[PDB]
């Protein structure tokens, strides 16, 4: 029948990977989810016109290490690195989430995509350049979302399906 990609949804406290998630889902904004819920969520999708049945682990909790973690990290195809737009230090925390997701793959062809989140906002911090230049480096795609308006939503997670097909 049909393929399954497994994502993982990464990034620093408040930048809105559960918002992110249940926009794509769910197609509403929510205003507050509960920081502390980490599950999946399941999702039949059309991409180019492929049937795909999305598992996306939407990640929370606490900063800990776990080897179930590194199990999700592990079976995990694809991911999104999410930071917002104006928040320094979650850029700044980019980095970390990168090398821990390598430490558990050991290796450098992951596919991933970098997603500055929270674009409805005035108020940035993060020149786009800046993180052009860091997905540059990377050798990943760069995509501006809003979980709000929904901006660049279907656009990140399609394109991160898309770098898993190219890397498959
Ligand atoms: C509002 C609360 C919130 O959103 N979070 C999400 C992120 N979470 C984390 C951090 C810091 N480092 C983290 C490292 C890992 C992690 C990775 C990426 C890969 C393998 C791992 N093995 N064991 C842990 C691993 C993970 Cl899942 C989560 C982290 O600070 C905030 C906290 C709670
Ligand atoms: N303006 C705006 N607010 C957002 C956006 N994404 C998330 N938020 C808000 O920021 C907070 C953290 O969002 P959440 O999805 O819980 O962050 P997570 O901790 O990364 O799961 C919540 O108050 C969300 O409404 C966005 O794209 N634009
Ligand atoms: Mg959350």
Redesign the pocket.
Same mark, same amino acid.
Do not use: L
């Given at each position: 029948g049909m393929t399954e990609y497994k994502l993982v949804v $990464?990034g620093?406290? /408040?930048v809105g990977?559960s918002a992110l998630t249940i926009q794509l889902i769910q197609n509403h904004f929510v205003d507050e989810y509960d920081?502390t819920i980490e599950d999946s969520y399941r999702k039949q999708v059309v991409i180019d016109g492929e049937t795909s049945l999305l598992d996306i682990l939407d990640?929370? /909790?606490?900063?800990e =290490?776990?080897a179930m973690?590194?199990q999700y990290?592990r079976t995990g195809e694809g991911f999104l690195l999410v930071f917002a737009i104006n928040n320094t230090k979650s850029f700044e925390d980019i980095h970390? =989430?990168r090398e821990?997701?390598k430490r $558990?793959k050991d290796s450098e062809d992951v596919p991933m995509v970098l997603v500055g989140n929270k674009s409805d906002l005035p108020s940035r911090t993060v020149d786009t350049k800046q993180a052009q230049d860091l997905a540059r480096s990377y050798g990943i795609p760069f995509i501006e979302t809003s979980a709000k308006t929904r901006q660049g939503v279907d656009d990140a997670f399609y394109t991160l399906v898309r770098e898993i097909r190219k890397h498959k």
């Open positions: $990464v620093a406290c /408040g990977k920081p990640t929370a /909790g606490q900063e =290490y776990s973690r590194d990290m970390h =989430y821990q997701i $558990v």
